[PDB]
Each structure stands twice: as structure tokens, then as C-alpha cells.
């Protein structure tokens, strides 16, 4: 089947950076591969359907005539009801695999949009910010270590309350480029629109799937027998049955199971996209208390004001996920013992030099 | 079949850390791959079922009419007993492969939950604690070796009972950051909840499987013949048999074997998960006798008090599994000769420099 | 099917250069792989047609005679209408897969033309230009840095308005070979012709596909029954039906769906090619503001005059996509803070020295 | 077939250590792969059975009625003998592939038990003992070579009978840690239990296979015809044959051959497991003559007393197979010329220094 | 077919040594793969037999009755001759593929025995002997080269007939360990028994094949028709033919061709095994003329006396094949110009110094 190749080519699992949150990956897999799995199950493997239609032809008919009767009614699905002459069509039975493939292809568009319209700029931004932030280790331990060393040589105000301004407001301690970069990027609104579009496209496609299932299905759902006609053309001048009644749809159970599964999967999936969209509506300040003490990380928590819908919010969201790669996967993560005003400031310091790395 | 590719994708066997206990791996394998193997055996390979239903149609019927009769009763499994007209359905026969696939997918949820909600924090904690612990070798032999060398130069109380407090309680012999980390982690209760949920979900799913087998199976278990009706629609005004009796379920033996195997495997599996759950209800002090003497390993055995349901218990449980990698796969493991108060300590030190490694 | 092998061989995704824009790659993929996917879906996988024609032969005919009837009318598709004797032919039904393969092969010609006639020269020019531009970093910070160092030692006109001419118009600040190369390349009109031909070929082929679908299809589109004759030769002196009416085309739905999809995909694809063609109708001056201070990048923005249809336009278009590889993926890209006459020049300089790379 | 996949996954042929003896590997190969090979040969490849049952239905029956008759008796194997009405069943014919797969899976349990309960401790012990033993080379030639170079300078008792005690009982010639390790491991009894259980499980499974073949087979062994009944239910009120006699089992020869081969292979395999079990009931002193002279190897030959059943026996058995890896695959192995009291002691020495390796 | 997999796994073509002679490899290949090739050709590919038996049932019989007839005679091959009632069986027709597979498996036993019982010791001996022989180069050119250099400084008896005793009988010239090793290995008789058993097993298996072909074949060889009986059980009380004559064996030609080819191939193969066995009945002295002049190679030719059935004979036989690897694949092989008493020795020496390698 084409499902295996489709799942092999698409939905298949810089140089170290992570550009996709785990929840988005789970959503993408469970939203793209699910129709492929359904179509693979329905028309392959276990249920060898064979012919999806069976006809009760008269016994006078030969084998080839019966084959003609049962092959000219699969592509002409029309219920010739006696109630005038409303030939209700049963085309979803024939179009189900096409619809599943079309839905699977449609659900892949936001992924391409994200990879083509937002990955490069965000990758460049993250690379610059990590390259700048990796310099903040040897700036509070390599530069400020002459704080507790001189603290024991003096007492109080001019050793731990008057020098914290002559050293913090110093040339080697300041990062003007990063502050200007963050200030300029906070005003931007270009890459937040890609996130919003990526979520909204999935929401709209789910709504369209609901409309398709509620309008075309759910009507031919308990209908399994329909009466056709063959003498509707050049065969009208022949002596045989004018209404070849009781053509049966063999695969009705697969139809119902696929419809119910398609409804349930997306019903379960709906709130996750809403939560993902909501994630960008608030300023995350879980570990801000630690962030405001380190030199470079102070600026990250400083610019948290106003409307949270900016480029900075998405940059921070993608920054917290990459903050544990190999080098910040260190003291910063280890500093969970400092989450519990003259003793607090010292206790934060011999914690720093204990993890002096080499 | 699809079971082969499902087993190839899922259930397939940092950079050195072991984050899964062997019994958990065994349980996951035997709980996920079992329904897939049952599905592969039941509907492929050896037993080429062909058609799962056979009908005794009248000899007047043609080949196509008999095919219609036997194909319109597989998707309409309804026993028209004369006992009013209680049409009992035999839908488990048709739904067995779907149920097996659903169970296989359901058993994989706790694995994803553990891999997504507990692996990163546990990996970080293990990496930090291992990095702190690997420094304990050159602190009891490279620092304390000037004890027995001094012992031969004097006698008793001031040579082997007075400096054990001046040297053990020294700046180079203390690990304050690790002690604070362990104290902070003992209070936490986040990572143990993931373990408890991972085991409880498996127990709940086993109970659900038992309920499914006891309610829907075990009723159609010794029934192999049912009588159907075809004249229940547009075929009513036709002259043929109104009760096409004796439709035989050809694959009843496969049904019974699959049900019995599914019962037995999970009955065997039940106590292992309970043992895994109870593994966290006690403080394991099997090797605490040797740990207390080491400088850094002393803190691990010191903080074994109170309720054993903490994050420290899980961290220790996962730590004993990685304590034999390549460098702690050493004297620590070789210290099996100290499992049998002035001669005991000197023997414990004579053993120490024997494994001087270089 | 041959579709899988064809998609494997063709459409299969120096040493670092990007010689194809992403939009061109998307257009090529969509325009080439779509007919292959349609051919794979229509004549394989889901819809197993078997015999695309069915016949209503008389009951006197044997099995072999009926097979002869239904096999001698597939290769002689002629509707013997009674309206003289205008025997309309239905050859597109037979020729559809051939047409799809021919279209798939035809759409691959522009890619071959671009790869054979324009890739080497463009690669040569891009390599030379990138090599020359890479030397521009240590020529504004390693050469001009004695500007603000001297600026603090003096005041205004002879320190920041008279030295900007004695330093910019200096031997080490000139790249005369690169100016001559760009001047000579601006006069050339060879490589733009390949681009224009590559797009025009795709437009012409799309028009040809429209003509083919409009003239040969859309006529046999709602016709499913045709009456043939077998006594048109050596069988004329026999006693059997002279007009063997009601030969049915089984796969008419596949025909209609394939035609509609082929129309829709190319209708969607048309405007993208026009946008690509019009991309060369203007001089791109988006980031010319920051190019005009840098030493070597000044020449690129200087030569933007006259008609925009030159080789330099294509060179710049392909250079912009390659300007963020590993080394120019630096301060140049980070210079997003200089997109908002004495303070402006000094602000642009202290930013330059802050990103001093090593 | 599942046989190929099973043989590929299971039964598939640190970093240098040999943890499985060749005889155990051969036994595992023969005991695991043989049922898989028998199942692959029997129900695939050469003998394409098709339908394993054939029935002599009356000529009045149609094709579909005959198919019903011959398909409703494969799953209802009951011999309605006229001798009351002792309907003897023939379920082994249907259950043979399940039995073969179950035996193949059952024979794999001891391998898992040995790999999970004994490999790590044995590997650790082997690593430590080998790392201690490889040091014995430069301790009998780099330390005791001042025995013949002084022998020529003196004569007899104080040069070759009084120096062998002042040098052998010297600090550099002792291995106290290894001696204590061996003494502690001799008292243990944990590793021998895994060996004994691993062999006893195979013996028990062979006995179970014998019981299964003797109780269920060997009764239906020469029976090839049985008479069934179809009118045992809703078909009882019908006019046709009540005893559809002579249903023939087509694959009886495969049954007989598989049973005989299964008996023969395990009958041949039985004594090897017994030999492996008794391998541990004696102290191996084949090369103790050359071991008692080397410094480190003296301890291995010293501790051969008491009951053979202990952990040191298993350690020595696994160590003799690894003593020829790359470094002890040397003079130790080359010392085959010493296998034939003042001449023997000296003659043994210039053999040692001649193989001085560098 | 299983033949392809069997040929892939078994019969598939330290670290440099050659432990098998080319003739042994050829014999093993042509003795193991020949039955596999015969079984692959006979029951697959070109000659699609289909059903190996055809029956002439009466025209009154139906299709299913004829299928029962031809299926109940393949597993009951018994010629009910009228000559009492000596029912001769034709089981070789059914058992031929089993016999070919069993022969292929049986012929692999000597290879396994040789690999398991003789390869390691032979490898160790070859490694030691080659390592000792590799030192013989810089012992006749780097040591004795002061012979012709001093020969020109003197004349005859005390320069080239009295110095050939003070130089060859010197400490640096002698090889005592190698001489003792060869003397000890000459007395050994262990590894020659493995060679003799390896050849004798093949001879015995060829004799068994001859007996099997001459006893069971060659009797049913020109018989292609046999008459069966079906009324020999529960069908005896029926009105149909009681001697169902002319059941024909379709694949008799394949039977005859396979038998003749199997006879001929092993008839051709027999004398090669005899030649290989007789290879060890003599001392090979082809190049002993050049061996006796070299320092280390003299000992190899010295110990050639008595019964040639020893371990030394096989060691030399396998050393001749391995002596041309990379280093002895030199002057030793080049010394072919010296195979044609005062001038012979000086010519033999000036040839040695010309091949000085560096």
C-alpha cells in the first residue's frame, strides 16, 4: 500500500539545536500518521475485502453477465428508491481512501510552513543568544571571585554592600549588544505570526474534517442494501430484470469503525492545540528568581513587561528547551538548591565556586 | 502483516547511562509484543483461514448467489434463534484483530509517559551525582594514606584514634554541595509519582483486559453454528430460504486459543508489576556497611530515614544500576573481601591501597 | 509499478554551495512527482481494476468466446453509433498512463537544462565572489579600528570627518579586481537566459497539458457505455450479434478524478512560476542600507542601475541565499540592530568591534 | 513463515571475554533451532499441503457444499466410531505448529536466566582476576632472574636451595589481595546455582517433551481415516448423509516424520547436558604441575580441596577458556616442553628467559 | 527454498593464517553444496511439478472426489500388484528432498569436528613456529656476513673451512627452544588423528550414500505406473472402483537425473580423499636442499626420520602453505636460482647478501 511509503518519506525522524517542542512533535505524529494507519488497516492486511459489492443476480445469468452486473454497479452507486425518483448516491463508500489520503496530505502543510518560514531566523537568533550566554560563566566566578575572598578581610558595608555597585556596573561585566538585540527583537512580531498560523491551520483542518464527516457520512451509516438499475441506456431494449435489487455493501463495518476512530482521535487532539496556543499568552517566570542574579541572564528576565505577544516570548520558549545541551547542562541546572538580605547573597556565592568545573 | 512493522517501529532495542531497569524492559517487551505476536500468528503464516464463515446454501443456488449469501452474513453476524426474536450478535469474532491492536497500542502509553515526563530530570540528577561521586577515589587513598604510615611510628590512641577526627573532618574531606543536593532532593516528590503512575496504568489496563475477556468472550465460546436471515429487506419478496441455517464459524479454535493465551500471559505478568511497585517501599541497606566508611558515599547511607517514598529512593535505585560502568566497576566492586574495633579499620585500609589502580 | 522507480531515479534530493532556491525546489517536486503519484494511485494499490472493460455477451456464448469478445474490444475502442456511421474513438481511456508518464518525463527537461548549462559557471562566479568577500571582515575592524581610538584624542572635523577619506581611499581598502569582475559580469546576459528558458519551458508545458485535457478529455467524460461490432472482418459470415451493445468502461471514476486533480494542481502551481519570473524584474535593495558602509559590500550596492535584467542580478539572488553559511552567518546577520550625521557613524563602529569573533 | 523471523531475532551469534563455552553454545543452537527448522520444513518449502483434510462427499453436493463439509470438519476433529459413542479427538494434528513454537520458546528460558542472573558478576570476577594474573610475567623473570646468574658464582646449598626461600617469601613475590579474593570466592555458592538450574531446566524440558510425545502422539499415529458428523445441530433436520465417512488426513507422513525426528534429536542431545553437569564434580589438575611454580598461578593450584561444588570451580572453568586470548597466549601455552631434585629446578628457568617476549 | 538459506549460512567463505588447504576447501565445497544444488534444481524454478501424481479416475467422479483420489494416493504409495498381495511401496519418491537435506547436513560434520578439535592448537603451534622462524633472516646475513669479507683477506682452510665451525656452533646461532619444541611435538599423535578422522568420515558417508542409492533406488527406477486401492477402510462398503489403476508418477525423470548425478559426482570425488589421506604417508623433501644451509630451517629438515605419522608432519604441511604470507614471501621464495665443495658455499652466500631487503 501507499501508506507505508507515505509514512516513510514524510513524518520521518544547527547541528545540535532543537527547533521543535516535544508536544508539537507528538501532535504532528498523531495528526498526520493516524489517517495513514486507518487507511492501511481498512484496505489491506487483515480484512481482505476482495469485492466491496455483492449482487443477487438471477440464476439465468452466466458468470460473465453476473460479473458485468456487479462491476457496473460499483462505479454507479445510486439507490433507485421508489419514493420523484430520488437516486441517492453512496459515493463516500468509494471515496473513503481518497479522503483519508487528502486529509493526511492536508495535515502536513503547517509543518512545511513552519520549516520554511520560521526555522532559519529562529535558528540564527538562538545561535547568537547561546553563543553570547555561554560567556556568562567565567564572569561571575572568574571576575567576581574576589568578593568573599576580600569579605573575610573587612566587615559589612564597604565590603559587601558598597562594592557590589563598583563591580556590577563595570566594563567587563556589561553586555550592551545582547541588551540592544533583545530590545530590538521584542518589538518584532514576524515569527509569532508563523506560530499562530501553524496552530490555526490545524484547528481549521479539524473543523473541516468535522464538517465533512457530519455532512456526507452519518447519513449513509446504517444503509447496507440498495437497489440499482442496469437498463438505463443501450440495455433498455433487453428482456431481464429492470431493478437488480439488493446490492449489498460488504465493508460497512470498516466504514463505521474508520468514521468513529477519525472522530474520536481528533476530538482527543483538539485541546492540546488550544493549550499550545495559550502557552504564548503569559510571561513564564518559574525560574526568574535565579535568573536575575547572573550577569547575562539578568537581561533575559529584565525585559518581561507589556503584551506577552512578541518575538521575545517565542525566543524564550525555544531557549528554555535548549538550555540543557552540554555546557549550560551544568551549575545552572544544578542550582536547584538555591530555590528556597546579607546571608542570602553570600550563600549564593560559595555555591558557585563549588561547581568550578575544571 | 502490520504487526511486524509495528514491532519494528515501537519496542525496538547520556551515552552510557542506563535509565531503564532490566525487569521494566522485560515487562514492557512481554506486555507489548504479546498481542502483536498473537495477531501475527492468528491471521497469517500457519493457519491460512481463507474465509471465516461457511454457509450451507441450497443446491439450486449458483456460485455468485452462494457468495452473496456467505458474504452478507459476515458483516451481519446475528443469530436468529427461535427463542421475542433475540438476535444475539457475535461481533467479537469480527472485532478480535482490532481489539488486539488497540490493546497493543494501549500498553505503550506508560512507556511514553515515563520517557517524556521523567527521563530528563532523572538523567540530569544521575549525571551530577555520578560526576560528584567519581571524585571520591583520590580522597581516601591519596589523602588518608598517611595514617598507617604514621601508625607504625607511634602506638594506639594518638596515632589511630585521635587523628580520625582531625583528618576526616577536614576541608578536603567534605562535600557540602552534594549534601545540600541530596537534602533538597529528599524532600521532592515529583519523580516518584511518574513511577507509580507508570505501574498503576499497567495494572488498570490488565484489569480492563480481564473485564473485556470476561464480559464479551466466555459467552460466545462454545457456539460454532448460527442461523441467519437474508430476507430482512429488499429481498423479502423473493422465493428462497427465509432462515439460511447453519452458518459455521470456521476460526473458532483460533478464537479460543487466543483468548486463553491472552488470559494466561497477563495472569503470569501480574505479580512482577506488584514487585516493582513494592521495590520502593523499603530502604535498601544491603551494602551500607562498606558505604559509610567512604568519604563521599557516606552521605548516601547517612540520609536513609523516615518515609522511603521520596525522590532520593528512586535516585538511589537508578544509581546502583550505573555504579558498575567502567571506573566504579573497580575497587568498589572489588570490596567484596570486607563482608565478614582497632584491627578491623587497618585491614580495611590495607585492602584500599592494594587496588591502587595505577 | 514503474512510478516508484521513476520517482527514485529522477527527483532525488561546490561542496556546500546552494545552487537552487527553495521555491524552485518545491515547484520542481510538485510538478514532477504529482503525475507519478497519480499513476501509482490510479493503476495500483487501492483500486485494483483488473479488466477495465466489461461486456454483456449473449448467454449462448462460452467462456472462451466471451473472453474473445471482451478482449477484442479493449484494443478497438470504437462507439458504433446509429447516428454516416460516425465511429467515435475512446483512446484516452487506453492512453492515460502513457500520457502521465510522458508528462512526468517532459516536466524534467528544464531541470536537466539548468543543471547542464548554468550550474558550473554560476558555481565558479559564486565561489570567486565568496572568496573575495570573506576577506572583508579583517578590513573594517582590523584596519579602520584606529578611528574611535583616535577620535577620543581629538575633536570633530579632522578626526572623524577628514580621516574618513584618507583611510577609505587607501590601497588596502580597495578591491580593484572584484570591481572589474562585477563590472564585466553586469554586461553579460548569458546566465539570465537559462533562468528565463527554464521558467518558460514549464509555462509552455503547462499550457500544453491544458490543451491536451481540453481537447481529448472533456468529450469522453460522462460516457460509460458504447456499442461495438465484431463482424467487421473475417467474422462477418457468422450467425451472432452484429451490434454487441453495452460494453462498459469500469474505471470511469478514476478517469474523472485523475483529470480533475491534474487540472487543479497545475492551476494552483501557475502563479508561483510567474512570481519566480518576475523576481528578476527589479533591483532588490532591502539590505542595501547596511551594505554601503562595509568595504567590499559597498561595490555590490554601487552597481544597481539601468535595466535589472543582467547576470549580476542572478549572481546577487543566489548570493543572498548563500550569505548565511558559516562565516558570513555572523555579525552581518547579527547587524539587525542597525536598522532603525555624526553619532550614527560612531554607533555603527562600536557595534562592529563588539562582534570581534575571536 | 515465522520460523525465519524467530531464528533471526533469538539464537543469534567485557569486549573480548568469552562467557559461553563452545559445548553450551552448540547445545543451545541444536536445542533451539531444531524445532524452528522442523516447523519451517513441515508447513512450507517442499511439502505444500494446501488443505490438510480431504472428504468424500456425495456427488449430489455442489462445490460450495463440499467446501463447507471439508471446512467444518477440520475444526471439529472427532472420530464418531460405532463402538457409548466414544468420539476420539485428533487435536494434535491441528496443534502441532503451536507445540513446535511453544517448545522453541520454552527452550530459550535458561539462556535468558543465565544471561540475566550470572553474566555480570562472572564478568567482573574474570576482569579482576585477569588484571591480577597478567602481572605475573614480570615477576618470575624480571625478579627471579638473579638465580642462575648467581648460581654460576657459587655451588649448591646456599645458591640454589637456601635462596629459594629468601626470594619466594619476599614482599614483591606475594599477592595477598588476590589470595583473599580467591579465599572469599571459594566460600560462596551463588554462581554454581545458576549453572545447575540452567542445566536442570533443559533436562526437565526434555522430559516434558518426552511425556507430551508419549501421551498425545503414538496413539493417533497410524490412523489416517475418520468418520465425522455434520447433522449435530441446526442441520439435524435435513435430508443428507448423517455420517460423512472417510475424511482423510493428508499430512500424516509429515506428522510421523516430525515426531520421529523430535524424539531422535533430543535422545542424542540428552547425554551432553549430563556431561556438562558432571564437569563441575571434580577438580581439574591436568596442568597443575606447571601452575605451582609460577608466582601468581601458585594460588590457583593451592586452593583445590574439599568439595568441587563451589564458585571458584566455575571461575577456573571459565578462566581456562580465556587464558589464551593475546598475552597469556604465550610462554604459558608454549610451556609444553616441561611436561615429562636439583636439575629440574634449574632447567625450568632458562626455558622461561628464552621466551623473553621482547 | 531452504537450500539457498542453508548454502548461505553453512559453507560460507590468527588473523592471517591459513588453516585449510585449497584441496580440502574444494572437496568440502563440492561435497556439501552439490546435494543443495540438486535439491534446489529438482523441486523449484525450472520444473514446476505442481502435483507429483496424476490419477485416471472414472468420469462419474466429481472434481472434489478426484481431488480426494489424487490426495489419498500420494501419502499411501503402495503398488497393489496382482501377483500374496505383495504391496510394494514407493516411498523414495516422497522422501528424496529429505534424503538430500540429510546428506547435506551429514557431510558438514567433519568440517565442524576439524574446526572444533584441531584448529586452535594448530594455530598456536603455527604462530610460535613462524615467530621463531622470522628471526632467522638477520642471523645469516646480519651475523655471518663477516665471512666473505674476511675471505678475501685470507686463503682456504682457516678462512672458509675452519671458521664454519666457530660461527655456526655459537650461542647467537643456536635455537634450543625451537629444537625442544619440535622434538616434543614429533612424539605427539593427537592432531594427526583429527585429520585421519576427518577424511575417514567423508569416506564412510560416501559409502553410506552408495548403499542408500543401491538398495532403495535402482528398484523403483523404470516404474512409472502403479495401481492403488481406496476401499481399504471405511470406504469399503461403497459402489465404486476397487483397484484404481494407472496412478502415474509425473517427476520420474527428475528422480533418475538426480540419482545419476549423485552417483557420478561422488564417484569422481572418491580418489581425491584417498590422495589427501596418502599425503601424510611420506616425508616431503622437495626443497630440503636449501633448507639445510639456513640457521633455523636446518632443524626442520633435521628431524625427518622414522614413521612419518606424527604431529610434525601435519605442522610442516600447514607451514608450507603459510610460509609465503608477507615476510618469508621473499628471498626464501626467490632462492630458486640455487637449486642446480668450495665455490658452492661462496655463491650461496653472495646470493644471500644481494637480497638485503632494506
Curated annotation (Swiss-Prot), chains A, B, C, D, E:
The chain crosses the membrane at residues 29-49, 100-120, 202-222, 254-274. It is found in: Cell membrane; Cell junction, Gap junction; Endoplasmic reticulum membrane. GO terms for cellular component: endoplasmic reticulum membrane; gap junction; plasma membrane. Residues 1-28, 121-201, 275-358 are cytoplasmic. It catalyses: Ca(2+)(in) = Ca(2+)(out); ATP(in) = ATP(out). GO terms for molecular function: calcium channel activity; gap junction hemi-channel activity; structural molecule activity; wide pore channel activity. Keywords: Cell junction, Cell membrane, Endoplasmic reticulum, Gap junction, Glycoprotein, Ion channel, Ion transport, Membrane, Transmembrane, Transmembrane helix, Transport. Pfam families: Innexin. It is a multi-pass membrane protein. Residues 50-99, 223-253 are extracellular. GO terms for biological process: cell-cell signaling; monoatomic cation transport; osteoblast differentiation; positive regulation of interleukin-1 production. Glycans are attached at residue 60. The keyword Isomerase does not apply. Belongs to the pannexin family. Homoheptameric. Regulator of osteoblast differentiation by functionning as a Ca(2+) channel in the endoplasmic reticulum which regulates calmodulin (CaM) pathways. Allows ATP release into the extracellular space and activation or purinergic receptors. This is Pannexin-3.
Amino acid at each position: 500500500s501507499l501508506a507505508h511509503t507515505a509514512a516513510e518519506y514524510m513524518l520521518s525522524d544547527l547541528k545540535g539545536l532543537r527547533l521543535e517542542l516535544p508536544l508539537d512533535r507528538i501532535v504532528k505524529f498523531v495528526a498526520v500518521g493516524s489517517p495513514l494507519l486507518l487507511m492501511s488497516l481498512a484496505f489491506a492486511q487483515e480484512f481482505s475485502s476482495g469485492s466491496p459489492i455483492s449482487c443477487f443476480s438471477p440464476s439465468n445469468f452466466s458468470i460473465r453477465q453476473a460479473a458485468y452486473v456487479d462491476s457496473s454497479c460499483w462505479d454507479s452507486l445510486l439507490h433507485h428508491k421508489q419514493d420523484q425518483d430520488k437516486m441517492k448516491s453512496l459515493w463516500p463508500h468509494k471515496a473513503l481512501p481518497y479522503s483519508l489520503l487528502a486529509l493526511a496530505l492536508l495535515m502536513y502543510l503547517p509543518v512545511l510552513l513552519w520549516q520554511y518560514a520560521a526555522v532559519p531566523a529562529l535558528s540564527s537568533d538562538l545561535l547568537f543568544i547561546i553563543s553570547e550566554l555561554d560567556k556568562s560563566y567565567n564572569r561571575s566566578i572568574r571576575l567576581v571571585q574576589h568578593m568573599l575572598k576580600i569579605r573575610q578581610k573587612s566587615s559589612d558595608p564597604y565590603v559587601f554592600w558598597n562594592e557590589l555597585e563598583k563591580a556590577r556596573k563595570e566594563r567587563y561585566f556589561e553586555f550592551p549588544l545582547l541588551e540592544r538585540y533583545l530590545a530590538c527583537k521584542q518589538r518584532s512580531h514576524s515569527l509569532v505570526a508563523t506560530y499562530l498560523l501553524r496552530n490555526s491551520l490545524l484547528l481549521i483542518f479539524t473543523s473541516a474534517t468535522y464538517l465533512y464527516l457530519g455532512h456526507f457520512h452519518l447519513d449513509v451509516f446504517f444503509q447496507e442494501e440498495f437497489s440499482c438499475s442496469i437498463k438505463t441506456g443501450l440495455l433498455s431494449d433487453e428482456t431481464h430484470v429492470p431493478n437488480l435489487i439488493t446490492c449489498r455493501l460488504t465493508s460497512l463495518s470498516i466504514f463505521q469503525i474508520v468514521s468513529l476512530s477519525s472522530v474520536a482521535i481528533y476530538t482527543i487532539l483538539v485541546p492540546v492545540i488550544i493549550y499550545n496556543l495559550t502557552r504564548l499568552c503569559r510571561w513564564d517566570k518559574r525560574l526568574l528568581s535565579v535568573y536575575e542574579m547572573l550577569p547575562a541572564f539578568d537581561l533575559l528576565s529584565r525585559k518581561m513587561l507589556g503584551c506577552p505577544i512578541n518575538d521575545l516570548n517565542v525566543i524564550l520558549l525555544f531557549l528554555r528547551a535548549n538550555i540543557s545541551e552540554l555546557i549550560s547542562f551544568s551549575w545552572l541546572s544544578v542550582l536547584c538548591v538555591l530555590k528556597d538580605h546579607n546571608i542570602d547573597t553570600v550563600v549564593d556565592f560559595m555555591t558557585l565556586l563549588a561547581g568550578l568545573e575544571p
